[PDB]
Amino acid sequence: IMHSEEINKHYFDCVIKDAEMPCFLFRDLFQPFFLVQDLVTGDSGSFLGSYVLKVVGGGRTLNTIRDYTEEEIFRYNSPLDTTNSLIWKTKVERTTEDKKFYIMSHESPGVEWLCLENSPCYDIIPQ
Amino acid sequence: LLGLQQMILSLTQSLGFETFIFIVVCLNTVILVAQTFTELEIRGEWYFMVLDSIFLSIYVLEAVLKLIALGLEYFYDPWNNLDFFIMVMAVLDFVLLQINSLSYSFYNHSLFRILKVFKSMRALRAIRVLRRLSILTSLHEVAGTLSGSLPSITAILTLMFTCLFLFSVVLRALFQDSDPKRFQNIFTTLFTLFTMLTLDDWSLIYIDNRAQGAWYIIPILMIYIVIQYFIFLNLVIAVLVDNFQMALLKGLEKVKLE
Amino acid sequence: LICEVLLGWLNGFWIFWKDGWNILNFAIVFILFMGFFIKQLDMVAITYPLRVLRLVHVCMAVEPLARIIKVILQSMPDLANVMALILFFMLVFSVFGVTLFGAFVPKHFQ
Ligand SMILES: COCC(CCO[C@H]1CC[C@@]2(C)C(=CC[C@H]3[C@@H]4C[C@@H]5O[C@]6(CC[C@@H](C)CO6)[C@@H](C)[C@@H]5[C@@]4(C)CC[C@@H]32)C1)COC
Ligand SMILES: COCC(CCO[C@H]1CC[C@@]2(C)C(=CC[C@H]3[C@@H]4C[C@@H]5O[C@]6(CC[C@@H](C)CO6)[C@@H](C)[C@@H]5[C@@]4(C)CC[C@@H]32)C1)COC
Ligand SMILES: COCC(CCO[C@H]1CC[C@@]2(C)C(=CC[C@H]3[C@@H]4C[C@@H]5O[C@]6(CC[C@@H](C)CO6)[C@@H](C)[C@@H]5[C@@]4(C)CC[C@@H]32)C1)COC
Ligand code: NA
């Protein structure tokens, strides 16, 4: 939240904020930060390593999330899909084998939410 | 062509069509001044796009109907000409939006914002509303005398721009690689000279040049300042004072006329 | 000062109030006076400079000076109109500048 506040010069939380989870604006590029924690010893630090980030489920509301199938995950998270189904896109050169998914890191720009028309996040009107 | 256009007229200049459109324009400007806080624009983003498509449709209505009514006489008046240009910008950014993906990389694209400010230009129509209700004409007199002064204001303004432009050309020719941060490009030469013309930190560029390059810029800058700030801007002041003096003599003779 | 306001009132409440300089001097002396009773006004930021705004009506008797003040006061409404022009001009450009340089350089254009 501190880094999104700094890059995107503004932070607005959900109108009905929840202390457990802060909410991120679809306009702002979402760059998450993870840290590895040792439970045996107190030492906890940021995760300076690469990872593969994917969206594997979605819900119009909480308690409505549904895991997607492998083909759906491919069509949503991978740039190779021709159908306008991508949920997000990031500008990073690293990619996995067969170029299917990006390989992100803490130094990457971030995740840009775009919600093409086939993606489940499309055609959403406030209830 | 004589009955259809004529009824389009007599519905167009109607004393309800104008009020309907001014209600629309005052609503659009209250939205447009709502959108400049970031605490309301970010919340109420989804309703604002709906409302602005609505306003685009309304402006299609008005512009097409007025053109069909009044031929090229519509193009004749400049108040409308402003509206037509605003219309063109609105339709262009509409189609550009549809031909792109409405995402973050387009929010932060400069051309999207540039096309958005021209929407701000719709607020100008609001003055027309303020004119009918009245501005009280409290600044009718000042505006009238500014109106009288402008013909010579334009002339002296373009003369001093010309002086700016010549000095900018020669300064680019001479003082490259002596502080390239300031005027490595012709455009930044011209801007540096223009911002000198307001006398803000103008000694700083002399010192900056003298540090690494050389000081020949001091006679050029002194002569520049002499010509522009000392003999040109004072001309603007002088001509404005004389114009308002004529306004005052007119008022004195007019009040003695009664 | 209070004695002088009393003398002015001694000539008739209304004529003393049929002026502007008298109401100014009265306002100054009254704000000064209430400091004795109330406690949150008897502070230097409110009591010192008023004793200097009391000095202008004194300087008025120095008519090589007074004509300057009279010119300023007479020209004030025209300056109000010019001020209104400038503000009404500034608001429009403020709108345009925000809707351009918002979400970019927000130190000056939010
Ligand atoms: C009272 O009745 C007057 C009527 C004649 C009206 O003529 C109008 C012609 C259009 C004109 C010149 C007028 C007023 C606003 C003017 C606009 C203000 C904006 O200013 C600009 C330039 C300056 C910029 C800072 C902002 O944008 C232009 C783009 C915009 C503008 C100059 C376009 C032209 C407009 C006057 C005769 O009635 C008998
Ligand atoms: C009553 O009928 C009058 C009519 C003649 C009308 O002439 C008009 C010509 C345009 C002119 C000079 C007039 C009024 C407002 C003037 C504008 C006010 C703004 O002021 C400025 C300069 C000052 C700034 C503080 C704000 O912006 C200009 C950008 C803007 C301006 C000076 C552009 C020029 C406009 C008068 C003849 O009818 C028979
Ligand atoms: C043809 O004859 C017309 C005449 C009546 C003329 O009335 C004039 C009254 C002053 C008025 C309203 C007029 C034109 C330019 C107007 C200026 C343009 C500028 O626009 C603004 C606002 C919009 C900003 C974008 C720029 O600045 C104002 C600060 C400035 C302005 C709105 C101040 C008011 C001026 C019309 C009657 O003749 C019989
Ligand atoms: Na200065």
Residue nearest to atom 36 of ligand 2 (CA): B147
CA distance C59 to C67: 11
Q: Which two tokens stand for residue C13?
A: 């409440």
CA distance C65 to C56: 10
Question: How many residues belong to chain A?
Answer: 127
Kindly tell me the burial class for residue B220, based on how many C-beta atoms sit within 10 Å of its own C-beta (0-12, 13-18, 19 or more).
Answer: middle
- This structure's resolution (Å) is 2.9
Smallest CA–CA distance from C110 into chain B, residue: B37
CA distance A70 to B178: 62
Name the amino acid, one letter, at B91. Answer: V
Name the amino acid, one letter, at B33. Answer: V
Q: What is the DSSP string of B15-76?
A: TTHHHHHHHHHHHHHHHHHHTTSSSSTTTTHHHHHHHHHHHHHHHHHHHHHHHHHHTTHHHH
> Which spans in chain B are helix H?
4-12, 17-34, 45-70, 73-76, 78-98, 104-107, 110-120, 125-133, 140-174, 180-183, 186-196, 202-212, 217-225, 234-257
Chains that touch A (3 or more CB pairs under 8 A): B, C
Q: Which two tokens stand for residue B82?
A: 């402003």
CA-nearest of B117, B118, B97 to B106 is: B97
Count Cα atoms within 13 angstroms, Cβ side, for B241. 6
* Sign of the CA dihedral running C61, C65, C68, C73: negative
Q: Residue B36 is nearest to which of C85, C99, C104, comparing CB atoms?
A: C99
CA dist B197 → B160, B230, B232, B233, B239 (Å):
10, 10, 10, 10, 19
C69-81 core/surface letters (b: 16 or more CB in 10 A; e: else): eeeeeeeeeeeeb
- For residue C90, the 8-state DSSP code is H
Cβ C95–B142 below 8 Å, yes or no? no
Q: Which two tokens stand for residue A112?
A: 């840009």
In short, whether B3's Cβ falls inside 6 Å of ligand 1 is no
C6-40 core/surface letters (b: 16 or more CB in 10 A; e: else): eebeeeeeeebeeeeebeebbebbeebeeeeeeee
Smallest CA–CA distance from B30 into chain C, residue: C95
CA dist C41 → C1, C30, C35, C45 (Å):
19, 11, 6, 9
Kindly tell me the burial class for residue B129, based on how many C-beta atoms sit within 10 Å of its own C-beta (0-12, 13-18, 19 or more).
Answer: middle
CA distance C109 to C91: 13
CA distance B237 to A124: 60
| Cβ–Cβ < 8 Å for B178, B214 | yes
How many Cβ atoms from other residues are within 10 Å of residue B86's Cβ? 20
CA distance C14 to C22: 11
CA dihedral C27, C82, B231, B173 (to 10 degrees): 120
CA distance B166 to B190: 9
| Cβ–Cβ < 8 Å for B27, B19 | no
Given CB atoms, is B28 within the 8 Å cutoff of chain C? no
Could you identify the residue written with the tokens 């457990």?
Answer: A20
Please give all residues whose CB falls under 5 A of ion ligand 4, grouped by chain where several chains appear. B 199-200
Smallest CA–CA distance from A11 into chain C, residue: C103
Q: How, if at all, do strands A66-67 and A57-58 pair?
A: antiparallel
Residue B118, phi-psi category: left (phi > 0), alpha (psi -120 to 50), beta (remainder): alpha
| Cβ–Cβ < 8 Å for B95, B114 | no
CA distance B179 to C68: 49
Name the amino acid, one letter, at B253. Answer: E
CA distance C99 to C93: 10
In short, whether B76's Cβ falls inside 6 Å of ligand 1 is no
Angle at C39 between CA C38 and CA C45, to 5 degrees: 110
- For residue B175, the 8-state DSSP code is -
The residues, ordered by sequence, that sit 6+ positions from B43 with a Cβ below 8 Å of its Cβ are A12, A15
Q: What are phi and psi of A66, to 5 degrees?
A: -135, 125
Write out the H or E segment, with its range, that includes residue C99.
Answer: helix C66-101
Residue nearest to atom 15 of ligand 1 (CA): B79
CA distance B70 to B76: 10
The residues, ordered by sequence, that sit 6+ positions from B211 with a Cβ below 8 Å of its Cβ are none
CA distance C55 to C64: 16
CA distance A119 to B181: 48
Count Cα atoms within 13 angstroms, Cβ side, for B224. 26
How many Cβ atoms from other residues are within 10 Å of residue B188's Cβ? 15
| Cβ–Cβ < 8 Å for A24, A30 | yes
This structure was determined by: cryo-EM
H, E, C per residue of chain A: CHHHHHHCCCCCCCCCCCCCCCCCCCCCCECCCCEEECCCCCCEEECCCCECCCCCEECCCCCCCEECCHHHHHHHHCCCCCCCCCCEECCCCCECHHHCCECECCCCCCEEECCCCCCCCCCCCCC
